[PDB]
Amino acid sequence: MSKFYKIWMIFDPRRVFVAQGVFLFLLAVMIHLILLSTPSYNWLEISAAKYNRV
Amino acid sequence: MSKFYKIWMIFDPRRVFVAQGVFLFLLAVMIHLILLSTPSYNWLEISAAKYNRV
Amino acid sequence: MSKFYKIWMIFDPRRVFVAQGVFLFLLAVMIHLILLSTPSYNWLEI
Amino acid sequence: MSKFYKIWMIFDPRRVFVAQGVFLFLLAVMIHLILLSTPSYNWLEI
Amino acid sequence: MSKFYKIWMIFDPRRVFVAQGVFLFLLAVMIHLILLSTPSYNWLEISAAKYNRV
Amino acid sequence: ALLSFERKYRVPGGTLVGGNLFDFWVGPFYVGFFGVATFFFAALGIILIAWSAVLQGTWNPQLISVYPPALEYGLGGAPLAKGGLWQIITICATGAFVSWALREVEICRKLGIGYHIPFAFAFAILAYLTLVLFRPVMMGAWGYAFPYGIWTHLDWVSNTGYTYGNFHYNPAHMIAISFFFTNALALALHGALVLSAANPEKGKEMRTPDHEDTFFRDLVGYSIGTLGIHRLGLLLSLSAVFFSALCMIITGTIWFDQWVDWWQWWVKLPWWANIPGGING
Amino acid sequence: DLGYTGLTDEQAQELHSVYMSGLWLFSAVAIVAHLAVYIWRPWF
Amino acid sequence: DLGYTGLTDEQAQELHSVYMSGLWLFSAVAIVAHLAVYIWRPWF
Amino acid sequence: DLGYTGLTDEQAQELHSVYMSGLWLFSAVAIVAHLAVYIWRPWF
Amino acid sequence: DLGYTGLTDEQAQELHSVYMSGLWLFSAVAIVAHLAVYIWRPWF
Amino acid sequence: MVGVTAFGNFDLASLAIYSFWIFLAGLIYYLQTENMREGYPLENEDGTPAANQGPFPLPKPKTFILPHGRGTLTVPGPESEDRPIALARTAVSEGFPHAPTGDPMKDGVGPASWVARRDLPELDGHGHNKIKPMKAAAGFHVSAGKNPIGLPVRGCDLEIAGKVVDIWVDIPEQMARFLEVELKDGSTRLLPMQMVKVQSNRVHVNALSSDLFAGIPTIKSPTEVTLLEEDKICGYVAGGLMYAAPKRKSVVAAMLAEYA
Amino acid sequence: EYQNIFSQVQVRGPADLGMTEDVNLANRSGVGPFSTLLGWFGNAQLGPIYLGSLGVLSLFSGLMWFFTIGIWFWYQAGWNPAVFLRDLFFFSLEPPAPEYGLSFAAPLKEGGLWLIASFFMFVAVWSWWGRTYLRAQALGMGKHTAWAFLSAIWLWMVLGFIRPILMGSWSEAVPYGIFSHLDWTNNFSLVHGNLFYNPFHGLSIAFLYGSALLFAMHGATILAVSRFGGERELEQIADRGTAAERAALFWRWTMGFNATMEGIHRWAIWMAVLVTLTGGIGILLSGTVVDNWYVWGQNHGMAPL
Amino acid sequence: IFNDHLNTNPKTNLRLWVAFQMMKGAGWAGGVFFGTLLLIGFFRVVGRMLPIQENQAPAPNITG
Amino acid sequence: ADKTIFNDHLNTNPKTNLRLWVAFQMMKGAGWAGGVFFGTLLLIGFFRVVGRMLPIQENQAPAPNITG
Numbered sequence A, B, E: 001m002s003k004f005y006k007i008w009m010i011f012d013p014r015r016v017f018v019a020q021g022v023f024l025f026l027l028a029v030m031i032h033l034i035l036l037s038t039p040s041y042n043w044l045e046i047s048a049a050k051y052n053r054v
Numbered sequence C, D: 001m002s003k004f005y006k007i008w009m010i011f012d013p014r015r016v017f018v019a020q021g022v023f024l025f026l027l028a029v030m031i032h033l034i035l036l037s038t039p040s041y042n043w044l045e046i
Numbered sequence F: 001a002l003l004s005f006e007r008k009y010r011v012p013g014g015t016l017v018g019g020n021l022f023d024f025w026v027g028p029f030y031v032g033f034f035g036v037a038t039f040f041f042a043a044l045g046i047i048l049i050a051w052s053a054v055l056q057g058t059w060n061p062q063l064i065s066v067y068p069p070a071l072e073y074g075l076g077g078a079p080l081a082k083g084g085l086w087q088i089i090t091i092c093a094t095g096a097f098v099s100w101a102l103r104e105v106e107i108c109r110k111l112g113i114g115y116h117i118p119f120a121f122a123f124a125i126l127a128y129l130t131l132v133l134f135r136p137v138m139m140g141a142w143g144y145a146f147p148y149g150i151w152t153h154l155d156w157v158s159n160t161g162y163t164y165g166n167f168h169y170n171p172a173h174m175i176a177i178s179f180f181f182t183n184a185l186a187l188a189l190h191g192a193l194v195l196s197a198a199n200p201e202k203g204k205e206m207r208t209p210d211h212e213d214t215f216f217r218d219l220v221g222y223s224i225g226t227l228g229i230h231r232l233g234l235l236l237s238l239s240a241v242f243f244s245a246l247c248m249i250i251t252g253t254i255w256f257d258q259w260v261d262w263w264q265w266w267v268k269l270p271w272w273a274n275i276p277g278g279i280n281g
Numbered sequence G, H, I, J: 001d002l003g004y005t006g007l008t009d010e011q012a013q014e015l016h017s018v019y020m021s022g023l024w025l026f027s028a029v030a031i032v033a034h035l036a037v038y039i040w041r042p043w044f
Numbered sequence K: 001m002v003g004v005t006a007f008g009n010f011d012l013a014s015l016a017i018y019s020f021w022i023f024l025a026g027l028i029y030y031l032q033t034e035n036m037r038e039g040y041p042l043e044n045e046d047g048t049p050a051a052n053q054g055p056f057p058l059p060k061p062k063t064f065i066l067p068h069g070r071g072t073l074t075v076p077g078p079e080s081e082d083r084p085i086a087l088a089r090t091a092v093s094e095g096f097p098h099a100p101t102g103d104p105m106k107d108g109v110g111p112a113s114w115v116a117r118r119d120l121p122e123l124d125g126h127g128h129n130k131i132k133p134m135k136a137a138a139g140f141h142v143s144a145g146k147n148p149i150g151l152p153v154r155g156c157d158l159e160i161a162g163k164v165v166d167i168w169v170d171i172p173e174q175m176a177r178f179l180e181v182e183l184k185d186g187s188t189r190l191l192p193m194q195m196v197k198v199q200s201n202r203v204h205v206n207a208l209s210s211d212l213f214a215g216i217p218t219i220k221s222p223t224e225v226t227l228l229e230e231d232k233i234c235g236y237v238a239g240g241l242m243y244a245a246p247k248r249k250s251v252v253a254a255m256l257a258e259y260a
Numbered sequence L: 001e002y003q004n005i006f007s008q009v010q011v012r013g014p015a016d017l018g019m020t021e022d023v024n025l026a027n028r029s030g031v032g033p034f035s036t037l038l039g040w041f042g043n044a045q046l047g048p049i050y051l052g053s054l055g056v057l058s059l060f061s062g063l064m065w066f067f068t069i070g071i072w073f074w075y076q077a078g079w080n081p082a083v084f085l086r087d088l089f090f091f092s093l094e095p096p097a098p099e100y101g102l103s104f105a106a107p108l109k110e111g112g113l114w115l116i117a118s119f120f121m122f123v124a125v126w127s128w129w130g131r132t133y134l135r136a137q138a139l140g141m142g143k144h145t146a147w148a149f150l151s152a153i154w155l156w157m158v159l160g161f162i163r164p165i166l167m168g169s170w171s172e173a174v175p176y177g178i179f180s181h182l183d184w185t186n187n188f189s190l191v192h193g194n195l196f197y198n199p200f201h202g203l204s205i206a207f208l209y210g211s212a213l214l215f216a217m218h219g220a221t222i223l224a225v226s227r228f229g230g231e232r233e234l235e236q237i238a239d240r241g242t243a244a245e246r247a248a249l250f251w252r253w254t255m256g257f258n259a260t261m262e263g264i265h266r267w268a269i270w271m272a273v274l275v276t277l278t279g280g281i282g283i284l285l286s287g288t289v290v291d292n293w294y295v296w297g298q299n300h301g302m303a304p305l
Numbered sequence M: 001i002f003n004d005h006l007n008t009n010p011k012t013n014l015r016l017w018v019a020f021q022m023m024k025g026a027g028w029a030g031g032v033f034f035g036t037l038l039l040i041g042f043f044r045v046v047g048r049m050l051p052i053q054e055n056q057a058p059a060p061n062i063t064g
Numbered sequence N: 001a002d003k004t005i006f007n008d009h010l011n012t013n014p015k016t017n018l019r020l021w022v023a024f025q026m027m028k029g030a031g032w033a034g035g036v037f038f039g040t041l042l043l044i045g046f047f048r049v050v051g052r053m054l055p056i057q058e059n060q061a062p063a064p065n066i067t068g
Ligand code: BCL
Pocket: F157, F181, F184, L124, L125, L152, L153, L155, L156, L159, L185, L186, L188, L189, L194, L195, L196, L200, L201, L204, L205, L208, L275, L276, L278, L279, L280, L282, L283
């Protein structure tokens, strides 16, 4: 972590911030979707089972 | 958190605000549709079974 | 909430109002069609 | 049909337009209610 | 191993760093998915069995 | 983020809707009002495909499939889990395609070139709408449209073809196939010819259009020219798509039996219908 | 030239032109609505 | 005072006042419509 | 010192203050909506 | 002093300081979220 | 060899499909690198080289040997505008339009732009000029379709700008390229064939209005046209589409303007 | 507005006999008539056509192939012109039955005539390829047309020659006849399971649709920038004008990347070549390596079960 | 003060002026109609409140 | 563009002239939107009517893809 600031001498901050925001949003969507895919951790479904919705 | 204002020295507010509006509407629609897909939290059907519209 | 008027120092009202009208009509049509799709709330069939 | 514009030399546009708006809304409401009354065309129940 | 710095006299750091980031993220995703595929090391299902969520 | 010559062409104006609200570029892309619409629709469609994959249960991209409503739902709506997602994704896809065409129109206007390209794209859009909108509506159900899967819309193609026996016996289909094949041949010939003219034998000067015309008159005895060949390519591609759309609009709509029976009309012509011998009779 | 309201011929002609334009726009929208309804559920 | 469009403070304030008046009128009509629908056929 | 959009420090500070005010208003409305939904039908 | 982007050392240091502050705020929120989830339903 | 697998399900078919994926990736790389021969390296909106230059590197230089002793061309290489651009940036941030400062149609910016090409006539394979006026072209004559010579030229404002005096023709292709139009002042300009709608009575030009017909660039020699003059004339006429819209006397355009 | 689809005026002058280098003008024939009907669309001039040694060989072989099939069609019709017109599309020149395998011992009425016609077609096509290469070489051009034709020939050979050899029977090849070869393709599909689930069949279809898409895009672009004289593409390669720049900027602002006035032709030639290349590979694999493509797809994650 | 609306041409300025007039009148009419509708709805809800479903009364008038 | 002759529309104060000019703007835009939507609706209806006119009901095809 000593001289990481020099990365901004290599990469334009605007493009890097745009790509990082896009990447983080897509990654979070992917992980939430993967969790929703499994029968456990499907918070909607296991909540429906816990409270006897169906 | 104080210096975050400097982001506006990086990005033109017009483009950022347009992108933000589009993204927020898209995300809201996505989440509402996801809720409508599941048999639970499908508020339409939860009510329709409540009042016997079938 | 008081200073929101300053948004009009950022955006030309003509473009904003055109976009707003198009968006509102589009959203209303979308929601009405979604309601018409479901067997319930399909007021015609109900 | 060309000379119909001369009707505006007879009637003030303000009164005529107000009466026209009221009449059109009233007629539209009447027809919609008539359709809603019949078991057919009662789009809600259909 | 000392003279490896001379690689930067061959490659522009911008392109190399972009390629490196993309490659590392791609490899990490690939390995995580491979682990998720097998019934063992599918940490989601291993834990669901351990705590009897089924 | 500009080409060496791009600077002098980035000027305001040439936009159908929105004044200069969205008259700006994002990187190389040109946004515009219809670009905003295209991005929204595309993003929504892709995320809904991912969500339908979650509902289906499989994460294999080739197995993901978004089936349309069954035939029992007619032309009405369906539950999102069993038909609704297909319809939402189809509305998104149609909106994205139309907005893409209109954005291309705006870019053509800003550059001062002719409107041939969005017009050409409109043919592909109309063929897609024939397969998804016009034919199912004409036929009476959304279950006649194709699923949105990589290998499952091929199942739709195969089943729809074999409903009518060998689909090769469709005349509006034969014409379209011949147009597609002629288009591929023309494209190969044109690309190869311009490359051989611009990249001649090693050490020699660049050849001229006169050499191209000479080569194709030597080969087959007719040269169509440069303007001619580009006109011909556009016409062949558009005609292929048009006749394919026709072939699928008349199938199951005004013709319901096996397609070889259609070809039986020529055999039954009065002045050779009864003569013995040959394959037919 | 009754002039019961005070409008001249040019003013009346302009007003009638604009009013008829609005009337024809309204009628066109009504016609497309009736066509849509008739296709959906004819009444004859 | 960025002035990307050229409006002054007074113009922006007046425009926002009128726009918010229109927005509140639209919202009021929407609210009465939702109340009527909920009375006719509640969704909760 | 750094500059990419031409805004000065004061303009950036004012813009950020107004934008954060709007963000917090939006977040407050979202929070009350989530509270209402959770009371009506909890998901945990 | 490569300067492929034209930023000087001071600008780069300031930008990195602010960016790292934002990164650590985001990471802190993520950590508290993961702790809450693990308490609610551990995955180990 | 039917059904035999080296490992898992991998067999000859899987080997072929995977080798094809590798080949396809290589081919896409090669094709894009070939497409990176003109317009690179990327520039900023002021003129300095950009920070972002692309995942694909620039290709090795290649040389074209032009015919008739015109020289050689080396691409990629040092490319410069070789002209002044009359534009002013509207906003500080990147990615916004540059507004024209003076007259866009004369400054040569926007849709009315032009490139500083070679100031020499175009030559066919034999060494003669590729485009010649028909009256100086031996044996050439109108073969079919409505003859445009002698028909009045009408501008986009429905006013007559002149009369057609001659047709310029491409000698090898035997297709007409330019019309020569003589104005009231007696001088003659050129108009590309692609911009005129030869009707029964008149030649109609929807790009330019009548008053702008004098603004078209002229040619040095009456018996030839160079590539640079071609570029200037074509850019002028085409940019008339956008920069002569007010003067254009169109019914539907007028209705849209009244609407807006 | 004028959309440049058709010429609105035709001019004609002295006929262009063509360039002259390393080419024997004796073989070049005379210039034919000027056709106004074609003059509306492209060049009106027909000929002159080069008739070399390979030209004569190709013409003779192709004439004999066409006439052989015609005579068999006549025999199949009972030599009745009315039946010949009534059953022109339904005739067939079938390959030898599977009983004979690859043997040349088939009777002339049940397989020999097919072998003779196949030999004639083989000679005609290969002589034509040699002709294309030699014509390119005479003018000093590159041999790109030769290699694209070579791709087409590769698919043709796999269909007719190599695959029957690998399968071990002449009955695997394609019968000469319109509906006969349509039925041949349909049966080839049905025998080997869905050909749809052949991955190389899918790639071939991908590149055919891509050929149509790319030619539509390129034709529309060039017609849209023809008002700047963009159709003179060799000139644009030599000296980049505003036509090339406007086309490149349209495609860059549309989809983020572009081609040059030359590289788009590399894209075109490859998007056309890969059709027959991948099709030949896929057909070669079918039957030889896979006997049921649906089951192969099921085992390779493509089919649901 | 904003004075940018003044840029629209006059004939359109009034082509919308009386749009405003006539339909404002019936916007008043619509207000009346929806007020009556909401009054009827309020009485329907109060009717849903009371224990009326348990015991109802026959028709006072007969033969319809 | 040319000024109107009746000039009694000019008697409205500028603020209400505004309160309708912008109405006019935003909702001219969504009048265009409504035109597009109803055009597509009419196109679908035309194809539905042509489908009725034809004898589809008597003989119709089974579902191409599985599960309808
Ligand atoms: C029920 C039928 C089967 C099927 C069976 C087959 C079979 C079997 C084959 C194809 C093949 C092809 N199919 Mg399939 N096909 C089906 C469904 C489809 C669908 C669809 C939407 O459903 C599509 C778009 C396609 C499309 C395609 C093409 C991509 C491909 C042919 C390339 C080509 O140009 O060949 C034609 C080009 C040539 C033959 C080149 C000829 C070159 C020679 C040199 C020409 C000599 C001319 C001669 C001398 C005469 C000249 C005379 C005068 C001089 C003019 N198929 C279904 C699943 N299809 C082929 C392929 O490659 O598959 C992998 C193939 O063999």
